[PDB]
Each structure stands twice: as C-alpha cells, then as structure tokens.
A paper describes a structure:
To obtain molecular insights into how lipocalins function as allergens, we determined crystal structures of a major dog allergen Can f 1 ([name], aa 27–171) and its cross-reactive homolog minor cat allergen Fel d 7 (wild-type, aa 27–170) at a resolution of 1.6 Å and 2.2 Å, respectively. Can f 1 and Fel d 7 have a typical lipocalin fold consisting of central eight anti-parallel beta strands, a flanking 310, and an α-helix close to the C-termini. Both Can f 1 and Fel d 7 have an open positively charged calyx at the center of an anti-parallel beta-barrel.
IgE antibodies to Can f 1 can be found in ∼70% of patients allergic to dog extract. While the calyx of Can f 1 is somewhat larger than that of Fel d 7, both have significantly more interior surface area and volume than other dog lipocalins such as Can f 2 (15), Can f 4 (16), and Can f 6 (17). Can f 1 ([name]) and wild type Can f 1 showed similar pattern of the percent fluorescence reduction (data not shown). Subsequent molecular dynamics simulations for 3 microseconds showed that the carboxylate of the ligands samples between the two positively charged residues (R101 and K131 for Can f 1; R102 and K132 for Fel d 7). The negative charge of the acid head group is neutralized by the positively charged environment of the calyx, either by R101/K131 or R102/K132 in Can f 1 or Fel d 7, respectively. Indeed, simulations with 2 oleate molecules confirmed that 2 oleates could remain bound for up to 3 μs to Can f 1, however 2 oleate molecules only stayed briefly bound to Fel d 7. For both Can f 1 and Fel d 7, approximately a 2:1 ratio of oleate to protein was measured. We identified that the Lys131 of Can f 1 (Lys 132 for Fel d 7) in the calyx is the critical residue for ligand binding.
Numbering used by the authors: 27 to 171
C-alpha cells in the first residue's frame, strides 16, 4: 500500500475540526517517497507570508494497510483510495503541536480538478465530523526545490 501511494501528488483540498491559522498562498507538489522498511516520507513546500517553508513528515507503517503513525506516535494518518481513480484521501487524528486536531486531505495525481473527487471528499469529511469550510489549495512551482 505504501508503494501504491508513492510518488508525486497535488494536495487539492484540506479541512479540519479546528481553526488552522496558517493558510498557505500556494503549495508545491506533495512527494510521497516509499522508504526501505515500509515507512513513507511526505515532502511539500509552502509559500506563506513571502517565504518558502519546506515541510517533511515521516509516516510510520502499521499492520493495517493505509494506516500510519506520525509525530513520535502521537498522531495516526489513514491513507485510502478515493472512489475516483488517481485520487487518494488522507485522514489524520491526534496530537499536532500539543493540541488534538483532526484533518482530512484530498490528493490527486493530475492538476485537473475533479468535481466528483471533491464531492466525494466533502461527503467523506462530513462523515468524519469535519464540518468547517473546505480549503482548496493553489498549485504552483514557486518555492520548489
């Protein structure tokens, strides 16, 4: 499952059960690198407030396909295929910077926007009790490494 989601993605949309102050102006592609040993390394760059912010998150494999842990075990991340092909949905729960926050993210192989994938993501998000507005992200190679 790890190898299946590896490679280049576009982070299309995200939502949470809390405020999430830092809304980036744009993001570079999300790179999911499958590592020897089964873990995933997620890398993305954000343009926020006139500066380039590189983010690296190591996702640790569990016995459940698609289920990973993060941030020294204080966070769980579920990765599963969307009903629309070449899209994936992330859902995470637990601690993040010392607070309990739950998030969902929509990933797409291609930059083209899929209305069906977004609609399914909205439904998924509601079914997880993520009822804030859906935040759709701007794609750009600005700040790319």
């Amino acid at each position: 499952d790890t190898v299946a989601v590896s490679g280049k993605w576009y982070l299309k949309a995200m939502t949470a059960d809390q405020e999430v102050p830092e809304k980036p102006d744009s993001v570079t592609p999300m790179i999911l690198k499958a590592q020897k040993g089964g873990n995933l390394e997620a890398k993305i760059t954000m343009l926020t407030n006139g500066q380039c912010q590189n983010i690296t998150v190591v996702l640790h494999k569990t016995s459940e396909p698609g289920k990973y842990t993060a941030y020294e075990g204080q966070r769980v991340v579920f990765i599963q295929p969307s009903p629309v092909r070449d899209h994936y949905i992330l859902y995470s729960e637990g601690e993040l910077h010392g607070r309990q926050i739950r998030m969902a993210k929509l990933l797409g192989r291609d930059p083209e926007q899929s209305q069906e994938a977004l609609e399914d993501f909205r439904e998924f998000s509601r079914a997880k009790g993520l009822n804030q507005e859906i935040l759709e992200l701007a794609q750009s190679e600005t700040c790319s490494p």
